[PDB]
Amino acid sequence: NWGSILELDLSKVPKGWDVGKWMYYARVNHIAVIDSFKEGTIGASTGKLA
Amino acid sequence: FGSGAIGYEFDNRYLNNQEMSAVAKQRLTSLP
Amino acid sequence: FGSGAIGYEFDNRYLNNQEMSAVAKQRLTSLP
Amino acid sequence: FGSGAIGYEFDNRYLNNQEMSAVAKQRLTSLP
Amino acid sequence: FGSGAIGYEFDNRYLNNQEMSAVAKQRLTSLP
Amino acid sequence: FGSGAIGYEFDNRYLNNQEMSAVAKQRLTSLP
Amino acid sequence: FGSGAIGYEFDNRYLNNQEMSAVAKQRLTSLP
Amino acid sequence: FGSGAIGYEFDNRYLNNQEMSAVAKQRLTSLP
Amino acid sequence: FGSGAIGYEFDNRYLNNQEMSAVAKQRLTSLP
Amino acid sequence: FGSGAIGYEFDNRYLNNQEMSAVAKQRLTSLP
Amino acid sequence: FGSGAIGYEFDNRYLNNQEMSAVAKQRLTSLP
Amino acid sequence: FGSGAIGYEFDNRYLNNQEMSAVAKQRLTSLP
Amino acid sequence: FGSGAIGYEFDNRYLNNQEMSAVAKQRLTSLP
Numbered sequence: 001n002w003g004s005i006l007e008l009d010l011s012k013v014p015k016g017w018d019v020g021k022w023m024y025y026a027r028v029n030h031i032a033v034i035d036s037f038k039e040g041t042i043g044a045s046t047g048k049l050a
Numbered sequence: 051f052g053s054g055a056i057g058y059e060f061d062n063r064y065l066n067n068q069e070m071s072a073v074a075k076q077r078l079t080s081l082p
Numbered sequence: 083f084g085s086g087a088i089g090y091e092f093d094n095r096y097l098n099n100q101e102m103s104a105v106a107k108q109r110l111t112s113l114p
Numbered sequence: 115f116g117s118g119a120i121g122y123e124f125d126n127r128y129l130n131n132q133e134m135s136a137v138a139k140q141r142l143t144s145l146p
Numbered sequence: 147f148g149s150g151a152i153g154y155e156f157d158n159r160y161l162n163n164q165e166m167s168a169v170a171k172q173r174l175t176s177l178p
Numbered sequence: 179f180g181s182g183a184i185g186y187e188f189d190n191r192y193l194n195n196q197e198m199s200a201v202a203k204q205r206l207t208s209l210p
Numbered sequence: 211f212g213s214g215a216i217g218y219e220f221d222n223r224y225l226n227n228q229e230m231s232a233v234a235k236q237r238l239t240s241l242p
Numbered sequence: 243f244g245s246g247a248i249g250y251e252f253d254n255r256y257l258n259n260q261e262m263s264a265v266a267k268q269r270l271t272s273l274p
Numbered sequence: 275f276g277s278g279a280i281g282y283e284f285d286n287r288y289l290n291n292q293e294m295s296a297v298a299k300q301r302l303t304s305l306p
Numbered sequence: 307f308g309s310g311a312i313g314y315e316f317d318n319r320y321l322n323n324q325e326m327s328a329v330a331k332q333r334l335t336s337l338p
Numbered sequence: 339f340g341s342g343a344i345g346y347e348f349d350n351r352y353l354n355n356q357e358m359s360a361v362a363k364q365r366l367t368s369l370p
Numbered sequence: 371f372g373s374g375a376i377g378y379e380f381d382n383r384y385l386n387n388q389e390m391s392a393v394a395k396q397r398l399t400s401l402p
Numbered sequence: 403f404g405s406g407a408i409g410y411e412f413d414n415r416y417l418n419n420q421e422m423s424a425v426a427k428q429r430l431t432s433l434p
Contacts, residue, residue: 047080070104166200198232262296358392
């Protein structure tokens, strides 16, 4: 028995940020800045991907 | 006889309106 | 014989109505 | 021979009905 | 020869039925 | 030669059937 | 030459089938 | 020359197939 | 000249394919 | 002159493609 | 005069494209 | 007279555009 | 007589607009 495991995608972690310091400041602030306009998300917004 | 400056511009305008219909059927579709 | 001021304006008006049909099929679509 | 006041008004009326069909396809669409 | 009172009324009636088709495509649309 | 009582009634009946098609496209629409 | 009892009944039957198509497009619609 | 027993049956069969298309568009609709 | 055993079978086959299209539009509808 | 082995096979192939279109409109429908 | 190796291949290619349209309307439907 | 290098390429291009329309109707459908 | 630099460019432009219509029917479909 371990806890629940959250499956997390990092497609919206903003540019120029590492996953380490981005997760570090979300421990503290309980807020995580994201980017819904990353280049990895051009598919769903433009209607090209699901 | 012959003079073709109004036969040209009417034929050039019919191919323009036919081209205009063809570019109005173009769709960049937006499902996945 | 010849006189072409009513053949011109009827041909110019037929290409106008054909152009008018072509611009009425134009759609700037509004899905993502 | 020649007289063109009924050929004119019938041709002018056919281009009117063709123009009337073209303006009945015009839609100012109402999605975003 | 010539007599055009039945050629006129049949041509006038064909343009009437063509006009009648054109006004039956007219829609005042009712989305926002 | 000439006799036009069957050319008339067939032309009058073709314009009737063309008129009948035009009034069958008429719709008093029922959205707001 | 001439005899028109089969030209008549075929023309009368073509206008019948054209009339039959026109009355098959008639709809008494059933929205408010 | 002349013999019309195959022109008749082909014309009678074309009007039959045209009539068959007209009765296949008939709908007794089933909304209120 | 004349021989009509291939004009017949091609005309008989065109009316067959036209009849085949007419019976493919027939629908016994299934709303109330 | 005359030779009809390529007029036959092209006419036989056009009636085949017309028959092929007619059997592609056939639907055994699947509502009650 | 006569030579039919380009009339044949263009007629054979038109019946091919007409056949290609007929097999693109074929649907094995997938309701019960 | 005769020269057929522009009649050929225009006929070859018309059958190409007709073939292009036929392959644009092809659908590998995606219901069960 | 003969000169074919405007017959060519109008025929080349008609096949272009016909090709433009054929590529506007092409769909890479997006169901499973």
